[PDB]
Design an enzyme around this catalytic site. Structure first.
Site, PDB file in Angstrom:
ATOM      1  N   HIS A   1      32.030  64.278  70.085  1.00 30.54           N
ATOM      2  CA  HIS A   1      31.609  64.426  68.704  1.00 30.54           C
ATOM      3  C   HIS A   1      30.232  65.073  68.656  1.00 30.54           C
ATOM      4  O   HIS A   1      29.372  64.789  69.494  1.00 30.54           O
ATOM      5  CB  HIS A   1      31.584  63.066  68.011  1.00 30.54           C
ATOM      6  CG  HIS A   1      32.770  62.209  68.321  1.00 30.54           C
ATOM      7  ND1 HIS A   1      32.856  61.439  69.461  1.00 30.54           N
ATOM      8  CD2 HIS A   1      33.918  61.997  67.637  1.00 30.54           C
ATOM      9  CE1 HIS A   1      34.008  60.795  69.468  1.00 30.54           C
ATOM     10  NE2 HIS A   1      34.671  61.115  68.372  1.00 30.54           N
TER      11      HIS A   1
ATOM     12  N   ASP B   1      38.686  45.934  38.667  1.00 35.79           N
ATOM     13  CA  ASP B   1      38.191  47.154  39.289  1.00 35.79           C
ATOM     14  C   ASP B   1      37.866  46.831  40.734  1.00 35.79           C
ATOM     15  O   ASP B   1      36.932  46.070  40.999  1.00 35.79           O
ATOM     16  CB  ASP B   1      36.960  47.692  38.575  1.00 35.79           C
ATOM     17  CG  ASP B   1      36.290  48.798  39.347  1.00 35.79           C
ATOM     18  OD1 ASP B   1      36.781  49.941  39.292  1.00 35.79           O
ATOM     19  OD2 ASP B   1      35.279  48.523  40.024  1.00 35.79           O
TER      20      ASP B   1
END
Length: 1146
Positions: free
Chosen positions: A697, A8
């Site tokens: 931003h 995983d």
RNA sequence: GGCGCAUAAAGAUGAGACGCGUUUUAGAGCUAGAAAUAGCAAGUUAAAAUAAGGCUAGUCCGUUAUCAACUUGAAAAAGUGGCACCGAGUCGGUGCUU
DNA sequence: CTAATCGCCAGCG
DNA sequence: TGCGTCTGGCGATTAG
DNA sequence: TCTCATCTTTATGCGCCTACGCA
């Protein structure tokens, strides 16, 4: 004895599990080396591995670029001094020496302290004459007296050192210097406003004088000049103060125009182009060239120094010893700005600037790739599109492909006369000239063609001839000209590269030809499509694509046909592990994760007795969406722009049109997404410049790590650089809220962008976390681990086949394992311990093995037993810290002993310097030190902190280094190095991780039983069920009948905090806070128990909040016990251990 | 699972440039005072450095990636640790056999 | 008296 | 034989 | 903050290849 491996992969963890056929996990006794008593550890073959996140190479690139401009600036001023030096030494032969040592204190200088004139009265009279430098520049421009040489040098040096931008190109009253006049006007307005405000606050508010004009810590005027106050904070401080008084109308007018008490050098001076300074420099040179002869002798050199700039395709001027250089020289000499173009070959360097980046042909790995807008590439794509169309007509029983003459006439007729064609135009315009047209049904294609000969259209528009582009003997020549229009995008070398072909074309078309510009590179090479041939055909690839008998084979069927000789030519055409990993391309974070998981699976193969596994099960992060939402996320930008423009009032598209391919630059897509206005002030926006404005931003790059379209806003220059590191304030909200809410109705922006737009209505920071960069990295890392594990594991070639499948690689989706988790109540909570990585790796292995084998309902007891084991090998990877030396800021002077010097001969007691360095690793030393006044050898054993700045000087020779540190009679064999996260086992099973040098971190884990985490997962998510409700009232009453469990959970923390935590003040404070909340609903109590669990996590201590009581962090700030504890050296999985006992050293 | 074309979003790697900011010094502070001090005047600019530094002396390089211990090797790289069974508060015990 | 403990702080457009 | 893929450092302060 | 250039991955539409276990 056959087994399987489940993995995983994440961005901070790798979970591994080894299962047998019956889904067990075996246990093994491992031998432990060292010098302790215990010699064998039983361990379970299941675990995880944690590490710090690998970062990208962007900040290193920014600081590497910043390192070069300082050296180039110092070289510019060095060139100016080298010109001036002789006539400077004629009049005052200490001037540059005085200028170089001005930083030193009054006794460290070797000359007089006043830098310009030496004596005091001349310096005082000079500063009384010219209060700034702009007064001197305006005086030198306007006046016509023979000035002193030192003032001329000061003006020229100030012009050369700060020179302005280079965005515009070419060239661009009472005075000839507008910039100095503007700065003098600003200075005089500052002086008048200052004395007026001083007299007014003396009159009307005599008590508030000292807070404004004398305090250095507040945001008053004395904090504006001397302290750390910006312009916005000073205006926000002073505005209600003079709004409350009377007689301040013009000052409020100026403050609403942002022209009150302004400085000369400030943040928005970046819009000044260099032509202004160039004009001022040429003016003062033409003025004072008559007096001094050597100014008139080399004026052009001084003007060349200011305007010279290294072009971006040349690169760093190295001499074959750099790592980022590609420059080639025609000679071997020093590159001054005057002999630049006489030394460096600009054409070959400009070609190598492009050629070093492009790919190779993935089928022929030695050939370079064709340009995208080439003629042969367009012919290839349009024939590959046309050679699979199917038509059915009136006399068509079975459908058929086209004919070679038909495909010739089609590309002769309509492709070479239109930019883009449709299916309806193909059915109507061509088949009007064909008799067989009655019931036309055309399959395999859509409404319009996705391939076009647009370069042929631009060439017939430019050259105004079809005979040149229709012939074949011109063909290769045409290829070459496209190459030039892809390579050199600077119209000075294109004439030199293209002069050989102007003998075939006119002069006007040659002048109109060099303005053409193309970009983009294809995916195949010309030696694949026209280089190789077949055996007996005599036909190339494109010759088969023009006509292929009856099959009408496309490209893949051509290069995969075993009846031809293309696959064998591809196969006859087609190192170290860490070198191959370094030979990969992508982000370095997934490189780190790939290398770790490959080392883990190789070590697990080595543990199990050299036998290869049977199955390897990995989980990926790709999905399979629907056609409706998948096409809604695939619709173009000219859809949304035209829809919003149709919805709202629109006059911008009356004279300013936009196609679907011209709109790709980010400085135009935001211009049309915001209806042609600045988004922070209600004013008209321009498109005639369209580059001088800045994209910003909303949430700054300091706090978050996103740059998407849901954060970028195109604003003006002064508005972006006005704010620095915050969401824009409530004045911008109160001004532009109605306009932004009007733009929200057209669905130009989303609700999350408008939520980020008005974050200042709540605060500068509400909370971070889930960023889609991790979603990129997980997909990349699972694709790479599947490919490299299939390549590395199965090695044996079959004779007539490829290989032998000794081990299979299965890839699963998270939907299936989450469905299996949600079915049989095997729930998980992310905020308890770190066992969930190993647990879901085990679940991936079980689900993959069962789905291959069976298609299962009898044996769930062994899964419920292995999902409650206490032993799981959690390993934190020990790293050696590298990076910056210390914090970047420069602290003023004090008499402390923890101030690192900034240079060699700059003592920090009188100059100040950096502070708080980063410790790379530590060492354990033992020696004898003189104990002060007694001064005899007293035995010590303590930890040193080797910083990053002293690592090379320690590894060169350790003994003299720590001898000069203040130690004597050391044992070189008894020196142990210790990186970060080194593991110590203290008494009673308490583990500590070494943080840096005098700080530790929590090491133990919490093994909670499965009933408690089941009841705690059902206690949260109570009001929701993620679907329709049935048979959940029994779950509700199951939560309701088990409140007593929660009290037991507190006991399950409390004794644990008596064992390994030892933070009793926060413990009994939070149990008192729990005892004061024994009456709330169960949902909020569970929601705060999952916040209570962060007391006993692994790693660094943290702070949290229970209900409203905030519990602060208990830090560990003592390292005088791990000198007498057990040091553990762990393997990559933690199965192989080496235990050193530090108590027996001495 | 892998290609070619068209559309869109999210990013990555490299080169050339601006504008600030920060730190020391220079911009003679005056008057009343033994003074601890108080009143008053003034403020906007400049120089230098911007990872310590390094040798390969370039208008170059210096914050990304690799990194448990042990035995070899200059490094590169190689090698080093028994198996079943009953159980489970961070792993324990049992028999084989080395 | 020296070692815990509290609170602040961290180069940027 | 066909079919699906945020954490350490540091000054100020207190406790022993 | 500005300018320039080249790459990867993901999802739709179209064409097409194969590995290989599953119905």
């Amino acid at each position: 004895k056959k087994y399987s491996i489940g993995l995983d992969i994440g961005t901070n963890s790798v979970g591994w599990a080894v299962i047998t056929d019956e889904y067990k996990v075996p246990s093994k006794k491992f031998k432990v080396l060292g010098n302790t008593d215990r010699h064998s550890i039983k361990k379970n073959l299941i675990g995880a591995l944690l590490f710090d996140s690998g970062e990208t190479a962007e900040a290193t690139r920014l600081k590497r670029t910043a390192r070069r401009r300082y050296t180039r600036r110092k070289n510019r001023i060095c060139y100016l001094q080298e010109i001036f030096s002789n006539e400077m030494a004629k009049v005052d032969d200490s001037f540059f020496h005085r200028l170089e040592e001005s930083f030193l204190v009054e006794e460290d200088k070797k000359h007089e302290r006043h830098p310009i004139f030496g004596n005091i009265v001349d310096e005082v009279a000079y500063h009384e004459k010219y209060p700034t430098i702009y007064h001197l520049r305006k005086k030198l421009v306007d006046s016509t007296d023979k000035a002193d040489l030192r003032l001329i040098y000061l003006a020229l040096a100030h012009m050369i050192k700060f020179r302005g931008h280079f965005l515009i190109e070419g060239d661009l009253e009472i005075t000839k210097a507008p910039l100095s006049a503007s700065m003098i006007k600003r200075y005089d307005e500052h002086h008048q406003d200052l004395t007026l405000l001083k007299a007014l606050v003396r009159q009307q508010l005599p008590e508030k004088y000292k807070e404004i004009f004398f305090d250095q810590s507040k945001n008053g005027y004395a904090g504006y000049i001397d302290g750390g106050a910006s312009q916005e904070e000073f205006y926000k401080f002073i505005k209600p103060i003079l709004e409350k008084m009377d007689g301040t109308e013009e000052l409020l007018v100026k403050l609403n125009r942002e022209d009150l008490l302004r400085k000369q050098r400030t943040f928005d001076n970046g819009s000044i182009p260099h032509q202004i300074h160039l004009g001022e420099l040429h003016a003062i040179l033409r003025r004072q060239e008559d007096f001094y002869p050597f100014l008139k002798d080399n004026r052009e050199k001084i003007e060349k120094i200011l305007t010279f700039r290294i072009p971006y395709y040349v690169g760093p001027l190295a001499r074959g010893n750099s790592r980022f250089a590609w420059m080639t020289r025609k000679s071997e000499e020093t590159i001054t700005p005057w002999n630049f173009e006489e030394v460096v070959d600009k054409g070959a360097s400009a070609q190598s600037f492009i050629e070093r980046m492009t790919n190779f042909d993935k089928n022929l790995p030695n050939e370079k790739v064709l340009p995208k807008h080439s003629l042969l590439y367009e012919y290839f794509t349009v024939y590959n599109e046309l050679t699979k169309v199917k038509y059915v007509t009136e006399g068509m029983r079975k459908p058929a492909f086209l004919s070679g003459e038909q495909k010739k006439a089609i590309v002769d007729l309509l492709f070479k006369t239109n930019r883009k064609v449709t299916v309806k135009q193909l059915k109507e315009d061509y088949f009007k000239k064909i008799e067989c047209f009655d019931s036309v049904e055309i399959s395999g294609v859509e409404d319009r063609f996705n391939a076009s000969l647009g370069t042929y259209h631009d060439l017939l528009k430019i050259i105004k001839d079809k005979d040149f582009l229709d012939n074949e003997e011109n063909e290769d020549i045409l290829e070459d000209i496209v190459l030039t229009l892809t390579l050199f995008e600077d119209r000075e070398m294109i004439e030199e590269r293209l002069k050989t072909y102007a003998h075939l074309f006119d002069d006007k078309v040659m002048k109109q030809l060099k303005r053409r510009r193309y970009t983009g590179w294809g995916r195949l090479s010309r030696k694949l499509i026209n280089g190789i041939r077949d055996k007996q055909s005599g036909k190339t690839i494109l010759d088969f694509l023009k006509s292929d008998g009856f099959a009408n084979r496309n490209f893949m069927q051509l290069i995969h046909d075993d009846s031809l000789t293309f696959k064998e030519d591809i196969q006859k055409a087609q190192d170290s592990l860490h070198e191959h990993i370094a030979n990969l391309a992508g982000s370095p974070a997934i490189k780190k994760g790939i290398l770790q998981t490959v080392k883990v699976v190789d070590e697990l193969v080595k543990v199990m007795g050299r036998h290869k596994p049977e199955n390897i099960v990995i989980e990926m992060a790709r999905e399979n969406q629907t056609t409706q939402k998948g096409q809604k996320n695939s619709r173009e930008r000219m859809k949304r722009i035209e829809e919003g423009i149709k919805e709202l009032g629109s006059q911008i598209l009356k004279e300013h049109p936009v196609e679907n391919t011209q709109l790709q630059n980010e400085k135009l897509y935001l211009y049309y997404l915001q209806n042609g206005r600045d988004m922070y002030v209600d004013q008209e926006l321009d498109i005639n410049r369209l580059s001088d404005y800045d994209v910003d931003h909303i949430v700054p790059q300091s706090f978050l790590k996103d740059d998407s379209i849901d954060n970028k806003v195109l604003t003006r220059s002064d508005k972006n650089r006005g704010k620095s590191d915050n969401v824009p304030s409530e004045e911008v909200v109160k001004k532009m809220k109605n306009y932004w809410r009007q733009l929200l109705n057209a669905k130009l922006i989303t609700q999350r962008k408008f939520d980020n737009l008005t974050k200042a209505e709540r605060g500068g920071l509400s909370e971070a976390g889930f960023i889609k960069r991790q979603l990129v990295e997980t997909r990349q890392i699972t694709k790479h681990v599947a490919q490299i594990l299939d390549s590395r594991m199965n090695t044996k070639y079959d004779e007539n086949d490829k290989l032998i499948r000794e081990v299979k690689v299965i890839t699963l989706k998270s939907k299936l394992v989450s469905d299996f988790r949600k079915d049989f109540q095997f729930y998980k909570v992310r905020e308890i311990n770190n066992y969930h990585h190993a647990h879901d790796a085990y679940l991936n292995a079980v689900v993959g093995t069962a789905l291959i084998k069976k298609y299962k309902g009898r044996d769930f007891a062994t899964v419920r037993k292995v999902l409650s084991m206490p032993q799981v090998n959690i390993v934190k990877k020990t790293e050696v810290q590298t990076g910056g030396f210390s914090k970047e800021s420069i602290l003023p002077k004090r008499n402390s002993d923890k101030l690192i010097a900034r240079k060699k001969d700059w003592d920090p007691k009188k100059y100040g310097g950096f502070d708080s360095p980063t410790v790379a690793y530590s060492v354990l030393v033992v020696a004898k030190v003189e104990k002060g006044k007694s001064k005899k050898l007293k035995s010590v054993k303590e930890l040193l902190g080797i910083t990053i700045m002293e690592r090379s000087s320690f590894e060169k020779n350790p003994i003299d280094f720590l001898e000069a540190k203040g130690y004597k009679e050391v044992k070189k064999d008894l020196i142990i190095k210790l990186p970060k996260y080194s593991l110590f086992e203290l008494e009673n099973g308490r583990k500590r991780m070494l943080a840096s040098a005098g700080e530790l971190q929590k090491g133990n884990e919490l093994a909670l039983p499965s009933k408690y985490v089941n009841f705690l997962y059902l206690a949260s998510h109570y009001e929701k069920l993620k679907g329709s409700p049935e048979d959940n009232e029994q779950k509700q009453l199951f939560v309701e009948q088990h409140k007593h469990y929660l009290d037991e959970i507190i006991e399950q923390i409390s004794e644990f905090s008596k064992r390994v935590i030892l933070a009793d003040a926060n413990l009994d404070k939070v149990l008192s806070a729990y005892n004061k909340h024994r009456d709330k609903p169960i949902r909020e109590q569970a929601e705060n128990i999952i916040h209570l669990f962060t007391l006993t996590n692994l790693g660094a201590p943290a702070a949290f909040k229970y209900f409203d009581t905030t519990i602060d962090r208990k830090r560990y700030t003592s390292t005088k016990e791990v000198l007498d504890a057990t040091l553990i050296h762990q393997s990559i999985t933690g199965l192989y251990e080496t235990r050193i006992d530090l108590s027996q050293l001495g």
